[PDB]
Amino acid sequence: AGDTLGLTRPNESDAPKISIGAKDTAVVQWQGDLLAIGATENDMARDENSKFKNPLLQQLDSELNGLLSAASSEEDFSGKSGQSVNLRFPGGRITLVGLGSSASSPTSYHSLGQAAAAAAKSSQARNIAVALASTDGLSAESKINSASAIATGVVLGSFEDNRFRSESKKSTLESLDILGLGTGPEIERKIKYAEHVCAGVILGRELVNAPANIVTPAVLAEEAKKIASTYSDVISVNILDAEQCKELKMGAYLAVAAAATENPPYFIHLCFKTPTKERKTKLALVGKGLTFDSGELMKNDMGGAAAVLGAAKALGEIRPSRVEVHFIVAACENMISAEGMRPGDIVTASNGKTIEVNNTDAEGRLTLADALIYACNQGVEKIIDLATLTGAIMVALGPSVAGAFTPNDDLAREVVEAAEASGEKLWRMPMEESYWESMKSGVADMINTGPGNGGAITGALFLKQFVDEKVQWLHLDVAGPVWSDEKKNATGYGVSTLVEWVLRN
Amino acid sequence: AGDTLGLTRPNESDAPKISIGAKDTAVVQWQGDLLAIGATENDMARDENSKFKNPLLQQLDSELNGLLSAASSEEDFSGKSGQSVNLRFPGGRITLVGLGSSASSPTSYHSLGQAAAAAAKSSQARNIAVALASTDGLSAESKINSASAIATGVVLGSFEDNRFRSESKKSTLESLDILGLGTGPEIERKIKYAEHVCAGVILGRELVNAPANIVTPAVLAEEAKKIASTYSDVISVNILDAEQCKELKMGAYLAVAAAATENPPYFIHLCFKTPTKERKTKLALVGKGLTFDSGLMKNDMGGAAAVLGAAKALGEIRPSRVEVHFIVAACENMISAEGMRPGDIVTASNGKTIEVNNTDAEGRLTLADALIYACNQGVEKIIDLATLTGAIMVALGPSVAGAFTPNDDLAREVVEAAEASGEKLWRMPMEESYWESMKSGVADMINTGPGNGGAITGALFLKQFVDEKVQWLHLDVAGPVWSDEKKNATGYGVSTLVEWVLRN
Amino acid sequence: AGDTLGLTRPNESDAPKISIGAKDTAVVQWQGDLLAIGATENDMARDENSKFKNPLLQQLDSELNGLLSAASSEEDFSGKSGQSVNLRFPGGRITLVGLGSSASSPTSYHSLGQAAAAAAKSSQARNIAVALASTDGLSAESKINSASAIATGVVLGSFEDNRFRSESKKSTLESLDILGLGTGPEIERKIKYAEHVCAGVILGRELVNAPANIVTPAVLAEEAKKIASTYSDVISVNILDAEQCKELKMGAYLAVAAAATENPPYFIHLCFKTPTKERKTKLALVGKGLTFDSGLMKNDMGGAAAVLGAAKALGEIRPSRVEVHFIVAACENMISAEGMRPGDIVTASNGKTIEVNNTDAEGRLTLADALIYACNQGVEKIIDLATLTGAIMVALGPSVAGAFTPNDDLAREVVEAAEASGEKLWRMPMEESYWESMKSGVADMINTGPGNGGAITGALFLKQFVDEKVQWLHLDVAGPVWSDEKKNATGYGVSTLVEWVLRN
Amino acid sequence: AGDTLGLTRPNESDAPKISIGAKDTAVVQWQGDLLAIGATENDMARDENSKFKNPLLQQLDSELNGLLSAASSEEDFSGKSGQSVNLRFPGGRITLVGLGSSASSPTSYHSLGQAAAAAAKSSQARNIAVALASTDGLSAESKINSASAIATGVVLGSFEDNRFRSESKKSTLESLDILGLGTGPEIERKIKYAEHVCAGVILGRELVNAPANIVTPAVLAEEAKKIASTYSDVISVNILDAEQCKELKMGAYLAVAAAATENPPYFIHLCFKTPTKERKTKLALVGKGLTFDSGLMKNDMGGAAAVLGAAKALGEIRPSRVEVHFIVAACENMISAEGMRPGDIVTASNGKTIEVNNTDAEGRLTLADALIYACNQGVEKIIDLATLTGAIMVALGPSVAGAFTPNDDLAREVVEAAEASGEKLWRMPMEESYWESMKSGVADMINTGPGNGGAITGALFLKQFVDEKVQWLHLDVAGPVWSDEKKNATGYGVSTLVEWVLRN
Ligand SMILES: [Cl-]
Ligand SMILES: [Cl-]
Ligand SMILES: [Cl-]
Ligand SMILES: [Cl-]
Ligand SMILES: [Cl-]
Ligand SMILES: [Cl-]
Ligand SMILES: [Cl-]
Ligand SMILES: [Cl-]
Ligand SMILES: [Cl-]
Ligand SMILES: [Cl-]
Ligand SMILES: [Cl-]
Ligand SMILES: [Mg+2]
Ligand SMILES: [Mg+2]
Ligand SMILES: [Mg+2]
Ligand SMILES: [Mg+2]
Ligand SMILES: [Mg+2]
Ligand SMILES: [Mg+2]
Ligand SMILES: [Mg+2]
Ligand SMILES: [Mg+2]
Ligand SMILES: [Mg+2]
Ligand SMILES: [Mg+2]
């Protein structure tokens, strides 16, 4: 760690790959450390004698001589969302997990998986199983989708980032058997898909969790190269250095980067494409990549870049045809030094527009200006950018819901549908044109920061100045959901939605 | 652009030089795109048939068959200050501009000229004229002065700084005929004088409008060199680098400059004099030149701008009875490992020590060494201009500068100069009893006193660095160098300084 | 002062070494410029004729024909703490100083000595004396301790730091005779001890009064080397540079130091011991040594100053039976491109990781590595002094330091040492339940907890870097190292630390 | 709820009285819903076959065929503080609760009892038991104290205040058997004592949890009258209204109360004593009783609540050898036309004048008159409790109260009482030099000093109203009266005050 500030050396991530499979084993006959069962409120109904009506629960309780029904009533478990009962008995352990009533997939089944991972961690389980108390009326396909969402919840719920702390226990969880939901090639493909996405989500969490003295712009570029190296027959990489970006006239990006002489900036360009020669839709994913932003209360730095690189990691495995995807991150750290940009400075973006920098706490959007111009210059048809852009969007939508801004109603609809499929939370917000007048400069084409009221909107209107009108473009302000204050950890928010969006194109 | 942070390049200022002349042409006979008429409230009086009493306005109206009087009453124009009517008719365009009642020159005539420029801009006028509705009761001198003030308004009102905008429209205005106020050599000399002063005001606006990534200290020094090069027979230049200032023991200035290793400091010294060898009154003009101040301050370097603006004007005017030293200790106040910390104790070139209790008041540290330097040139009188305090804006608002001097006579000179230029300033007291609040427990003084009286203690601080045999006045111009309404620099100070120099 | 920022050059200190002695001379027979007398309220009792009952005061008044009793009653002097009467008469000058009632020693005697110094300074006295109005009810040992405390007050009271200002007169005080409190070898050894401690206290004041552009980390290292050089038979020095600290894995200290590329860091290690071979208790004194802290606070480096002060005193006193390690991890906390960011995770030399959630609390990071280094020297007991928190001043005010230890015995030793020194400190609890608020979501801990309990969690942080086998006390001295009343450093801590070392 | 603001009506509390007893029943033979076992880390040691070495745990595990040891290791339970395992099996339920290593009693046993209550609540248990895994090395007396502490944890842990919300289930807990710690009259008397103290602690929690629109000063007086009525042979009451306090010259208290014309003030005086005629030590307990303070802080009235709590406990316990005065000057601090302004000068009932420079510190004005009233009852010792300052929370965090006294003996009594009660407090210094910052330019004193030292100067203020012949300690309880974690009042202070009274 000789050249790392603070001499910090990340511990080697020693997480096992969980072995996940869908089995036809009867639930009452399954043997291992922990069985988790997802039950709705209706699944917990009892008869005249206070016995479970549900066949699976009735049988498990019988075999336990009424210990499961007794514990459940004593502990007031009736299958409400978030509730759980944990029962250790001779030969095994059962946890019932409440699904509530009328809970949406995939989110309910993600939660179920998360709860199963938590109960595994708290009992040092190695081999676990998950099932639903009832699958009546469900198609083979809904069941497949529930299985893959359960898998996702277990994998993401088992992740623990211990790279920067001296005391930790490695995860005990080695296998997951998903029961009752089908077997064979199709359900296994879907589980594999989920696993590919999770590996992207987990990369995103790691990139964000890591502090700026570890994930520098040069380190972020190396992560990009590692993805390309792993998937070199479908992903290529081009890393531009400051001098190359200067030749491309990226004055807004380079001005933000100028202070940080010790950790130089790198402009990251990955391109995914299968070598086959059918028609491909050309897409870009642009992520804000300030590895530190001068403007540890805000632990969301780089969430956007992380979601973009996480998506690349997923897509490298999934290998969709019919799409060409450009992943673009203008990476730098925003520091303070004699070589730095001052408030009031006027910088020129690579499309010639001039920006009066009235607020040095909003420098991220400057880097995005040049990244968006670059994306448009790759000849893409559609762009999504993700950025932790404003506090204002968290005032508006809270910690958990990202704001989506687009001139293009169709692309809004695509992104809303992708989020519905992934389970991620977002909400379209208006690009109210009248607010652009508040962004006028008395010397330059525009200022970089408008009034507090409307701030997430004028942030979006700012970015629009750097997007070719013929390209469809949506901006996702993810300041809130990239970081979980409760878990004190990154989420990798965005990856799953982006993957779904690419795949549905 | 290549070596500029943000890759930003100033667009070439493409503005035409307006052709200005005084002409004897009767106002009703004049032909061109726009005729602007300045009318007082009394000039707009009407008779019992609602017809203008004023002979010029009566004639124009009757020639337009009552269209001008009708439009005027409909639009409630009665000649009040700020009022205007704009009438397009076959063969031309007239705008009447209200002058109010008993309004002071040159400000009223500046405003008239500004209003004419604005009406030109909004009609794309190329050739305009301006006249007063009545000139009777004005001396030949006052008419001359009115003409030059009109010219000033039109020139300054036509200026638009589009250097950093990727889209803009070039001024259409090409010529101004000033009517009814006299013709011949004298009025033409006065108009030319106004033009020379405007070019200095406009340089000042440009220096301030430009951001710190464009106007660095090196660039400020180049602008000084360019003035000397343009007027080389009357203006000389010496630019001192950090190592030269160090030999001159400028520890206060060099401490402030120490952080900014990327944009090194330059100490600017221009000297104006005509090349004849008669005795000349020796003056200095010192301007605060922090191209950026770490402590939105869009008024940074307003002082230095006014000082260089004055040089530019004087280089053209060539006054014979004066030797003027223009002095700017230019640097940017940044943050870095090489920088001065709060608490540091720095030593000015006169040997006095300063405890720097507040790094938002570093400007005055640079002025300390600039003032000592000025006194060392052997001058008789110094004016410094500086955006020194927020306190002065609390005291006097955005539009009126504060003037501080121990020397009553110099105060009177500067008040008279501002009366002649039209600029707003107000003397403030150098209340001695407040010096006690500037005591240090370790050094000779601290740099920043309490908020109450802050502009006064700022002045008292500077007075520590001025030879008491030299007459010295400090002008705290934090407010009026920048117009929040126009979102632009004003070039405040240039016209007053030039009038001050000339009256010496 | 070519390489000093601001070109500041400290003036050469010209303080007299005061000649101090204890004499058996009758107070009324003593000859010189000023006689100061310490009188309690009870000492000032008068009889039925309004004459002093105190024998000494009665005698002096009788010599002055009632002038002293008359001046006293007119000026309402009754011996209350802080009161004084100053009477100039033919052949000399007397000042009576109030000691109050049941005031604690040595503080009451320090104050006496300070008041005698102040009266000497205000009358330009060269030769002075001090006596108590009454020594009834005092042991020989208490009188000896009173005498040395009076000497301490006079020496410290006569100090004036004029290194950074032009206007000063050198102290006139040349001698002090202490009367009525005994004579001979023992009292003289005590006075000498007090003098040695004062020279340390004065070094401490100087190191703190000097600004960060003068006392950089290199300069602080040179001060350490000078101490070792002066006392080279009992004090050794090792200065470690950044590369050596990196080999010792001091990632927390080096992270804080990384920004300040212009003034590099030095880790200072002094060791005191007499060359005799009796068993020695191994002690460490660790001082926070941020010469400037980016998080006007004038208390920077008060901890390091106390530690180096103590070394200076101990070098002269030469106690046997101790080996004392003096450890200061010196650096300045600046802002640059090379600097640590908030959120960075740094690794101390014991392997523990710290998530730096607040860059205003970097001082404790340097102490982490200093404390580990101290434990690695195999010491039995450590005291650290550090200006660690604002919270401790909220808690205990400007004058009383907070003491934090797991070790009840060491608390008792430090409380007793302060009792003997006269310095004010108070033990505060290391409430363990607060450690939970120092959890990180990524590292082993954060560096800053919530405001409530901030001095406690500061202490609990430091505890993570201290071997449990070692007894350890943390002293948060943010308040008393700097006197806002004097506008000067106090050298707080030196006298206590010397008493602690001596009582081991 | 016609006359209550907001029409709020407290729901009737329906808490079971838990039946508590000590039994000699072998733990393995005990029958009921839930058995909780307190185990230290050392208790959880295993042998070479991974079987519990502890005899009780070995036996229980053997009955459960290894299920308990297996669940324990799987769930990483090793007996650390806060840890727990909960195992439901045929015929019952066991919970193992970690006690950590060398944790102090009674706190460790309180926590045990709280964890047993929580497990009862989460499993709807009616009949529970608690035992220690090991009682080796405990005296009979320590076991008795452990049992009563366990009872206290269970009773306090089972409390839930549902008066102001619609959704709640009544506690299922009906009985507790305490096992392994002894049987018979002595242990039963101790348990009974703990129950009496709990009923006080619970009254305290209720008085604080209730909002100011429910617990007004009139209502607080009625609570006092209810206590006296319940225990009328040992507790008498006198409620003084505003007019009576005016005759007693309580200008400081009445000034604070003047704004609140809608909810008038009442001065509460309870007196406890048994009717037997042995010598009784006269004590006062004074509580701050601002039912609302205009200066969301949920700690209002925590002091008064502790005092009334103590009266409730003492009414049942009936100690001989004491007479205890319980004094609360109750009012609300509001804003109206009738109110006190900042700057007003008020006169306390001892004649001293106070310039009220800060209306956020009015609570101390009411205490001034309460303390004078207490001294006028001829008591020997006074403790006041008050949520006086934010400063004390900065100092000591949320959990530890600050204790201020001139009287070293009383400090020792209160520190010992807290030791016995388990409550956290810490003595802080009454640094006399800070009194100078409380000077007024017009009155005898101001009411608020500078932020630094604010808890100390608070104490020094209160001292002005205390007869020096009376021993007096001030407890600043701003932190621990309210638990942000529970979102509920704690009734902090009651148990300590009861122990203090009993040890007199
Ligand atoms: Cl981002
Ligand atoms: Cl931004
Ligand atoms: Cl929509
Ligand atoms: Cl300026
Ligand atoms: Cl300044
Ligand atoms: Cl320190
Ligand atoms: Cl710190
Ligand atoms: Cl101990
Ligand atoms: Cl209270
Ligand atoms: Cl209060
Ligand atoms: Cl005492
Ligand atoms: Mg698999
Ligand atoms: Mg990070
Ligand atoms: Mg012309
Ligand atoms: Mg500018
Ligand atoms: Mg001597
Ligand atoms: Mg006097
Ligand atoms: Mg210092
Ligand atoms: Mg009972
Ligand atoms: Mg558990
Ligand atoms: Mg309440």
Side-chain angles (χ1 to χ4, degrees), chain A residues 91-103:
Chain A
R93 189 185 280 267
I94 287 174
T95 185
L96 308 184
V97 178
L99 300 175
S101 66
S102 299

mmCIF file with all atom_site columns, all heavy atoms in Angstrom, chain A residues 91-103:
data_model
loop_
_atom_site.group_PDB
_atom_site.id
_atom_site.type_symbol
_atom_site.label_atom_id
_atom_site.label_alt_id
_atom_site.label_comp_id
_atom_site.label_asym_id
_atom_site.label_entity_id
_atom_site.label_seq_id
_atom_site.pdbx_PDB_ins_code
_atom_site.Cartn_x
_atom_site.Cartn_y
_atom_site.Cartn_z
_atom_site.occupancy
_atom_site.B_iso_or_equiv
_atom_site.pdbx_formal_charge
_atom_site.auth_seq_id
_atom_site.auth_comp_id
_atom_site.auth_asym_id
_atom_site.auth_atom_id
_atom_site.pdbx_PDB_model_num
ATOM 1  N N   . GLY A 1 91  ? -32.637 -31.554 14.049 1.00 0.00 ? 91  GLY A N   1
ATOM 2  C CA  . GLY A 1 91  ? -32.507 -31.880 12.639 1.00 0.00 ? 91  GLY A CA  1
ATOM 3  C C   . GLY A 1 91  ? -32.606 -30.709 11.677 1.00 0.00 ? 91  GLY A C   1
ATOM 4  O O   . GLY A 1 91  ? -32.385 -30.875 10.478 1.00 0.00 ? 91  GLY A O   1
ATOM 5  N N   . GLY A 1 92  ? -32.939 -29.520 12.163 1.00 0.00 ? 92  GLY A N   1
ATOM 6  C CA  . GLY A 1 92  ? -32.975 -28.386 11.255 1.00 0.00 ? 92  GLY A CA  1
ATOM 7  C C   . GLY A 1 92  ? -33.493 -27.072 11.804 1.00 0.00 ? 92  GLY A C   1
ATOM 8  O O   . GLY A 1 92  ? -33.624 -26.877 13.019 1.00 0.00 ? 92  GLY A O   1
ATOM 9  N N   . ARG A 1 93  ? -33.744 -26.145 10.879 1.00 0.00 ? 93  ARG A N   1
ATOM 10 C CA  . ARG A 1 93  ? -34.191 -24.810 11.238 1.00 0.00 ? 93  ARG A CA  1
ATOM 11 C C   . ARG A 1 93  ? -35.167 -24.331 10.173 1.00 0.00 ? 93  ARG A C   1
ATOM 12 O O   . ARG A 1 93  ? -34.878 -24.418 8.983  1.00 0.00 ? 93  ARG A O   1
ATOM 13 C CB  . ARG A 1 93  ? -32.967 -23.904 11.345 1.00 0.00 ? 93  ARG A CB  1
ATOM 14 C CG  . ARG A 1 93  ? -33.249 -22.541 11.921 1.00 0.00 ? 93  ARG A CG  1
ATOM 15 C CD  . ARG A 1 93  ? -32.008 -21.671 11.871 1.00 0.00 ? 93  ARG A CD  1
ATOM 16 N NE  . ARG A 1 93  ? -31.071 -21.963 12.953 1.00 0.00 ? 93  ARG A NE  1
ATOM 17 C CZ  . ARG A 1 93  ? -31.047 -21.337 14.125 1.00 0.00 ? 93  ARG A CZ  1
ATOM 18 N NH1 . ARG A 1 93  ? -31.958 -20.430 14.431 1.00 0.00 ? 93  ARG A NH1 1
ATOM 19 N NH2 . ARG A 1 93  ? -30.052 -21.557 14.968 1.00 0.00 ? 93  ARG A NH2 1
ATOM 20 N N   . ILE A 1 94  ? -36.270 -23.744 10.611 1.00 0.00 ? 94  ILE A N   1
ATOM 21 C CA  . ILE A 1 94  ? -37.212 -23.134 9.703  1.00 0.00 ? 94  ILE A CA  1
ATOM 22 C C   . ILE A 1 94  ? -37.367 -21.652 10.004 1.00 0.00 ? 94  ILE A C   1
ATOM 23 O O   . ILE A 1 94  ? -37.437 -21.252 11.162 1.00 0.00 ? 94  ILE A O   1
ATOM 24 C CB  . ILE A 1 94  ? -38.584 -23.820 9.779  1.00 0.00 ? 94  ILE A CB  1
ATOM 25 C CG1 . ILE A 1 94  ? -38.465 -25.177 9.095  1.00 0.00 ? 94  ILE A CG1 1
ATOM 26 C CG2 . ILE A 1 94  ? -39.639 -23.010 9.031  1.00 0.00 ? 94  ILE A CG2 1
ATOM 27 C CD1 . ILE A 1 94  ? -39.694 -26.066 9.189  1.00 0.00 ? 94  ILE A CD1 1
ATOM 28 N N   . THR A 1 95  ? -37.415 -20.824 8.963  1.00 0.00 ? 95  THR A N   1
ATOM 29 C CA  . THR A 1 95  ? -37.894 -19.455 9.131  1.00 0.00 ? 95  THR A CA  1
ATOM 30 C C   . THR A 1 95  ? -39.070 -19.167 8.204  1.00 0.00 ? 95  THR A C   1
ATOM 31 O O   . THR A 1 95  ? -39.004 -19.434 7.002  1.00 0.00 ? 95  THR A O   1
ATOM 32 C CB  . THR A 1 95  ? -36.785 -18.399 8.941  1.00 0.00 ? 95  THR A CB  1
ATOM 33 O OG1 . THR A 1 95  ? -37.294 -17.087 9.239  1.00 0.00 ? 95  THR A OG1 1
ATOM 34 C CG2 . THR A 1 95  ? -36.220 -18.439 7.530  1.00 0.00 ? 95  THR A CG2 1
ATOM 35 N N   . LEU A 1 96  ? -40.157 -18.668 8.790  1.00 0.00 ? 96  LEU A N   1
ATOM 36 C CA  . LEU A 1 96  ? -41.286 -18.166 8.011  1.00 0.00 ? 96  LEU A CA  1
ATOM 37 C C   . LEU A 1 96  ? -41.109 -16.677 7.805  1.00 0.00 ? 96  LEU A C   1
ATOM 38 O O   . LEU A 1 96  ? -40.767 -15.956 8.731  1.00 0.00 ? 96  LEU A O   1
ATOM 39 C CB  . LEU A 1 96  ? -42.594 -18.397 8.761  1.00 0.00 ? 96  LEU A CB  1
ATOM 40 C CG  . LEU A 1 96  ? -42.851 -19.832 9.245  1.00 0.00 ? 96  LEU A CG  1
ATOM 41 C CD1 . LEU A 1 96  ? -44.236 -19.852 9.863  1.00 0.00 ? 96  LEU A CD1 1
ATOM 42 C CD2 . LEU A 1 96  ? -42.764 -20.826 8.093  1.00 0.00 ? 96  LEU A CD2 1
ATOM 43 N N   . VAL A 1 97  ? -41.304 -16.222 6.577  1.00 0.00 ? 97  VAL A N   1
ATOM 44 C CA  . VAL A 1 97  ? -41.099 -14.827 6.216  1.00 0.00 ? 97  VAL A CA  1
ATOM 45 C C   . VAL A 1 97  ? -42.385 -14.267 5.652  1.00 0.00 ? 97  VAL A C   1
ATOM 46 O O   . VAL A 1 97  ? -42.945 -14.823 4.700  1.00 0.00 ? 97  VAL A O   1
ATOM 47 C CB  . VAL A 1 97  ? -40.012 -14.705 5.132  1.00 0.00 ? 97  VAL A CB  1
ATOM 48 C CG1 . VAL A 1 97  ? -39.833 -13.255 4.730  1.00 0.00 ? 97  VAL A CG1 1
ATOM 49 C CG2 . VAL A 1 97  ? -38.697 -15.272 5.652  1.00 0.00 ? 97  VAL A CG2 1
ATOM 50 N N   . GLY A 1 98  ? -42.843 -13.159 6.224  1.00 0.00 ? 98  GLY A N   1
ATOM 51 C CA  . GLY A 1 98  ? -44.124 -12.578 5.842  1.00 0.00 ? 98  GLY A CA  1
ATOM 52 C C   . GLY A 1 98  ? -44.023 -11.868 4.515  1.00 0.00 ? 98  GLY A C   1
ATOM 53 O O   . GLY A 1 98  ? -43.102 -11.101 4.305  1.00 0.00 ? 98  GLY A O   1
ATOM 54 N N   . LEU A 1 99  ? -44.941 -12.160 3.598  1.00 0.00 ? 99  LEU A N   1
ATOM 55 C CA  . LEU A 1 99  ? -44.988 -11.458 2.317  1.00 0.00 ? 99  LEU A CA  1
ATOM 56 C C   . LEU A 1 99  ? -46.074 -10.373 2.257  1.00 0.00 ? 99  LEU A C   1
ATOM 57 O O   . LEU A 1 99  ? -46.246 -9.716  1.230  1.00 0.00 ? 99  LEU A O   1
ATOM 58 C CB  . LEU A 1 99  ? -45.201 -12.472 1.202  1.00 0.00 ? 99  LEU A CB  1
ATOM 59 C CG  . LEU A 1 99  ? -44.111 -13.540 1.088  1.00 0.00 ? 99  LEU A CG  1
ATOM 60 C CD1 . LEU A 1 99  ? -44.443 -14.584 0.029  1.00 0.00 ? 99  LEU A CD1 1
ATOM 61 C CD2 . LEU A 1 99  ? -42.770 -12.894 0.777  1.00 0.00 ? 99  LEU A CD2 1
ATOM 62 N N   . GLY A 1 100 ? -46.897 -10.292 3.300  1.00 0.00 ? 100 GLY A N   1
ATOM 63 C CA  . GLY A 1 100 ? -48.005 -9.354  3.342  1.00 0.00 ? 100 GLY A CA  1
ATOM 64 C C   . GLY A 1 100 ? -49.169 -9.804  2.480  1.00 0.00 ? 100 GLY A C   1
ATOM 65 O O   . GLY A 1 100 ? -49.358 -10.997 2.255  1.00 0.00 ? 100 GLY A O   1
ATOM 66 N N   . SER A 1 101 ? -49.940 -8.843  1.980  1.00 0.00 ? 101 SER A N   1
ATOM 67 C CA  . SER A 1 101 ? -50.963 -9.127  0.978  1.00 0.00 ? 101 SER A CA  1
ATOM 68 C C   . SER A 1 101 ? -50.770 -8.194  -0.222 1.00 0.00 ? 101 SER A C   1
ATOM 69 O O   . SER A 1 101 ? -50.397 -7.021  -0.093 1.00 0.00 ? 101 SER A O   1
ATOM 70 C CB  . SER A 1 101 ? -52.347 -8.963  1.611  1.00 0.00 ? 101 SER A CB  1
ATOM 71 O OG  . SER A 1 101 ? -52.590 -7.613  1.979  1.00 0.00 ? 101 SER A OG  1
ATOM 72 N N   . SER A 1 102 ? -50.923 -8.747  -1.415 1.00 0.00 ? 102 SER A N   1
ATOM 73 C CA  . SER A 1 102 ? -50.846 -7.940  -2.626 1.00 0.00 ? 102 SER A CA  1
ATOM 74 C C   . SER A 1 102 ? -49.486 -7.261  -2.727 1.00 0.00 ? 102 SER A C   1
ATOM 75 O O   . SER A 1 102 ? -49.400 -6.078  -3.054 1.00 0.00 ? 102 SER A O   1
ATOM 76 C CB  . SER A 1 102 ? -51.952 -6.872  -2.663 1.00 0.00 ? 102 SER A CB  1
ATOM 77 O OG  . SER A 1 102 ? -53.253 -7.436  -2.658 1.00 0.00 ? 102 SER A OG  1
ATOM 78 N N   . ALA A 1 103 ? -48.417 -8.006  -2.479 1.00 0.00 ? 103 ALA A N   1
ATOM 79 C CA  . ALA A 1 103 ? -47.099 -7.464  -2.763 1.00 0.00 ? 103 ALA A CA  1
ATOM 80 C C   . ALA A 1 103 ? -46.572 -7.776  -4.177 1.00 0.00 ? 103 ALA A C   1
ATOM 81 O O   . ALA A 1 103 ? -46.710 -8.874  -4.737 1.00 0.00 ? 103 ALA A O   1
ATOM 82 C CB  . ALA A 1 103 ? -46.114 -7.870  -1.679 1.00 0.00 ? 103 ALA A CB  1
#
